[PDB]
Amino acid sequence: LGEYEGERNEVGERHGHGKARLPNGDTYEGSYEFGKRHGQGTYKFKNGARYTGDYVKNKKHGQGTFIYPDGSRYEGEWADDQRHGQGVYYYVNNDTYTGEWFNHQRHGQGTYLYAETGSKYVGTWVHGQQEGAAELIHLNHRYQGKFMNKNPVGPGKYVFDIGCEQHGEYRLTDTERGEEEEEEE
Amino acid sequence: KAPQVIPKEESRTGANKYVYFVCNVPGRPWVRLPSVTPAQIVTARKIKKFF
């Protein structure tokens, strides 16, 4: 048995705002529709995870922030089906993804920062793995090719901040074969 | 979750057995080259850059 505060109907349908504790032990804050939740509020889990958001129809919704048990965090928009669009996620090892989202997996155009190296990936995503029409950004290198699961593939090219452009062919999984084209810019 | 850094070996039984002095043209003063760290070998082996 939990407990609750805020205004309510004589039936028991809450329609106010306040703190609350649920039967399964965890506490939260937020507003209320007649028998449902909304408003900014804040959720607190037993494991230390937290959520602030719109809470539409008692579902994860709207612009907000979620702090997961493993120390990773999110800020961005959510919807009922774990959807979608612009947002940012920060990983346990200080890496950061910023871009489109879908059903809790990375999807569409987006950016991933490799905080250990400082380089970035910028490209299309589907269901978490990498895809082509993409761009890695190193300190002096830019590929500018195609990707498949995790590694580059296909007729890509390495662009440099010297005034050079090197084409290539990732024929194997992690080996490049080069062409004679080294044209400027 | 940063990785564990592997410490350098200042002892003479490692990569730093021999000190190295580098000079650009003879007669110029010799530059005391730094010591080796394993981070400075790997993943530094993977890069390959002109001097």
UniProtKB/Swiss-Prot annotation, chain A:
The protein's name: Radial spoke head 1 homolog
Main function: Functions as part of axonemal radial spoke complexes that play an important part in the motility of sperm and cilia.
Domain of life, per lineage: Eukaryota
Cellular compartment(s): Cytoplasm; Chromosome; Cytoplasm, Cytoskeleton, Cilium axoneme; Cytoplasm, Cytoskeleton, Flagellum axoneme
Alphabetically ordered keywords of this record: Cell projection, Chromosome, Cilium, Cytoplasm, Cytoskeleton, Flagellum, Meiosis, Repeat
Transmembrane spans: none
Tissue: Expressed in the trachea, ependymal cells, oviduct and ependymal cells (at protein level). Germ cell specific. Specifically expressed in testis, and to a lower extent in ovary. Not expressed in somatic tissues.
GO CC, alphabetical: 9+2 motile cilium; axoneme; condensed nuclear chromosome; cytoplasm; extracellular region; meiotic spindle; motile cilium; outer dense fiber
Residue segments, region Disordered: 1-25
Stretches assigned to coiled coil: none
Ranges annotated as biased composition (Basic and acidic residues): 5-15
Species this chain originates from: Mus musculus
MORN repeat residue intervals: 4-27, 28-50, 51-73, 74-96, 97-119, 143-165
Quaternary structure note: Component of the axonemal radial spoke 1 (RS1) and 2 (RS2) complexes, at least composed of spoke head proteins RSPH1, RSPH3, RSPH9 and the cilia-specific component RSPH4A or sperm-specific component RSPH6A, spoke stalk proteins RSPH14, DNAJB13, DYDC1, ROPN1L and NME5, and the RS1 complex-specific anchor protein IQUB. Interacts with RSPH3B. Interacts with RSPH4A. Interacts with RSPH6A.
Biological process per Gene Ontology, one example term: spermatid development
UniProtKB/Swiss-Prot annotation, chain B:
Location of the protein in the cell: Cytoplasm, Cytoskeleton, Cilium axoneme
Gene disruption: observed consequences: Mice show hydrocephalus and the tracheal and ependymal cell cilia show clockwise rotation motion instead of planar beating. All three types of radial spoke heads (RS1, RS2 and RS3) are missing in the tracheal cilia.
Domain of life: Eukaryota
Tissue specificity annotation: Expressed in the trachea, ependymal cells and oviduct (at protein level). Abesent from sperm (at protein level). Expressed in brain, kidney and testis.
The family this protein is said to belong to: Belongs to the flagellar radial spoke RSP4/6 family.
Function: Functions as part of axonemal radial spoke complexes that play an important role in ciliary motility. Essential for triplet radial spokes (RS1, RS2 and RS3) head assembly in the motile cilia.
Assembly mode: Component of the axonemal radial spoke 1 (RS1) and 2 (RS2) complexes, at least composed of spoke head proteins RSPH1, RSPH3, RSPH9 and the cilia-specific component RSPH4A or sperm-specific component RSPH6A, spoke stalk proteins RSPH14, DNAJB13, DYDC1, ROPN1L and NME5, and the RS1 complex-specific anchor protein IQUB. Interacts with RSPH1. Interacts with RSPH3B. Interacts with RSPH6A. Interacts with RSPH9.
Protein name, per record: Radial spoke head protein 4 homolog A
Organism of provenance: Mus musculus (Mouse)
Organism ancestry: Eukaryota, Metazoa, Chordata, Craniata, Vertebrata
Covered range of the whole protein: 411 to 461 of 716
